[PDB]
Amino acid sequence: AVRIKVDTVNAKPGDTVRIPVRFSGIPSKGIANCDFVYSYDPNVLEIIEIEPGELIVDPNPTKSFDTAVYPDRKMIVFLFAEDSGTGAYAITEDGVFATIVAKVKSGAPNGLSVIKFVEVGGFANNDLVEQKTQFFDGGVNVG
Amino acid sequence: TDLDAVRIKVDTVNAKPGDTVRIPVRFSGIPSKGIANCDFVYSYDPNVLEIIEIEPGELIVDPNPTKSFDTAVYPDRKMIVFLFAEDSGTGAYAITEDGVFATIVAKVKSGAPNGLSVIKFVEVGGFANNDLVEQKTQFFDGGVNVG
Structure with a gap:
């Protein structure tokens, strides 16, 4: 199974923090596409940007990776679909899939x-076979 | 209905339990300037409708439609996410006319009420023209009148 984990990072109100989303157990056949959702608290963290991680091998990262943040529904949608269409830009190793850049609101507890x-949703290898996954929570420990 | 807004509306189609139905998502009031990107979410009842596929609509002009258009369906959370961002980078594939943005293809479960x-x-989320200026929008619901 591929393990997906959002880091837990420490920050103080006002800080702009980076929260890695890491993949481990990436199969030999890679990961051609994957999409999933995490929830967050928009009253405490303002999502500034979500950067493609080192695992995104596409020369034009944004062509293979995208995210959509919906503050009202409190969700972050992650979308990866290797852009080559041949499996060429599939993720092939463990590491940082994305980095959430969030600002800790000044009055956060x-x-x-x-x-x-x-x-x-999907999480498939280059044979487009769904892979078993195990997702873990993270966040920001405000101090 | 705000004539200065882009109105987005999902059709309301009639169907019987067991039918595979097509439910267009239409855009009206598209600025001639064109829409370079848009993303939004609708909810549905996965206990009545099994989403089979969401097809790029006639408005998706990219010769590689999947590079400009994508959707994500989450049955557990009962949501459908629509994502459009014209792939050319120059505004070449912006949406520039009124019509079908996408088509939801769904099966009405045999035991549907x-x-x-x-x-x-x-x-x-966003709904921007080619100069990246956010456009006023009005979203309307639709669904399947099961009978």
């Missing part, structure tokens, strides 16, 4: 603001 |  796994 | 199974607007 101390303690953990959770970034929780909500749902996975 | 009679009545309207609503496909309801949830939230809009």
